[model samples]
Target chain A: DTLDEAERQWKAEFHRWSSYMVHWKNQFDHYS
Target chain B: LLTPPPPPLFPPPFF
Candidate 1:
């Protein structure tokens, strides 16, 4: 819990970034 | 209409 603006926002951003960077960009970007 | 769930957490880079 302890959610806030950053938590809510970062999740979506992270998801988007990872989705694109990982999947769309390719499997090489493993979020390391 | 929507339901507000409990607050979530961002462990890293959190305050």
Candidate 2:
């Protein structure tokens, strides 16, 4: 249970950063 | 050849 909780927290942060990275990539994609 | 087994784990996004 504790390990799963830790993993969930880690995955939560990973989701945030990965989403940010994709957003940043999209910004560059619009660069012209 | 026969088909291979499916992956057991989730793959990362944007492969």
Candidate 3:
């Protein structure tokens, strides 16, 4: 179950990063 | 109980 939990955590982190990137892009466009 | 893994590399891919 270690790999499963690691994968789930990775997916959660990936989603977090993706959302951050999207927000950054939106902010950049708003400023530029 | 498990030991902690090493810190991960999070260098940005600036291209």
The better candidate by DockQ, 1 or 3, is 1
lDDT of 3 by residue, B1-15 (tens): 332332343444322
Compared with the true structure, what per-residue lDDT tens digits does model 2 show for residues B1-15?
332332233335321
* Chain A TM per prediction: 0.49, 0.68, 0.90
lDDT of 1 by residue, A1-32 (tens): 65687688777776765555435334333333
Clashing pairs in 3: none
Clashes of each: 2, 0, 0
lDDT of 2 at A19: 77
The candidate that wins on TM-score is 3
Question: Where does model 2 exceed 4 Å of error?
Answer: B1-15
State TM-scores per candidate.
0.40, 0.54, 0.66
- DockQ for candidate 1, C-alpha atoms: 0.06
Candidate 2: lDDT of B4? 32
lDDT of 3 by residue, A1-32 (tens): 87788777777776777776776667666665
Worst 10-residue lDDT window for candidate 3 chain A reads A23-32
Model 1: residue A13 alpha-carbon error in angstroms: 0.4
Clashes of 2: 0
lDDT of 2 by residue, A1-32 (tens): 87788777778867777676666666656663
Query: Which residue pairs clash within candidate 2?
Result: none
In model 2, the fraction of reference contacts reproduced equals 0.00
Give lDDT per model, in order. Answer: 0.51, 0.58, 0.60
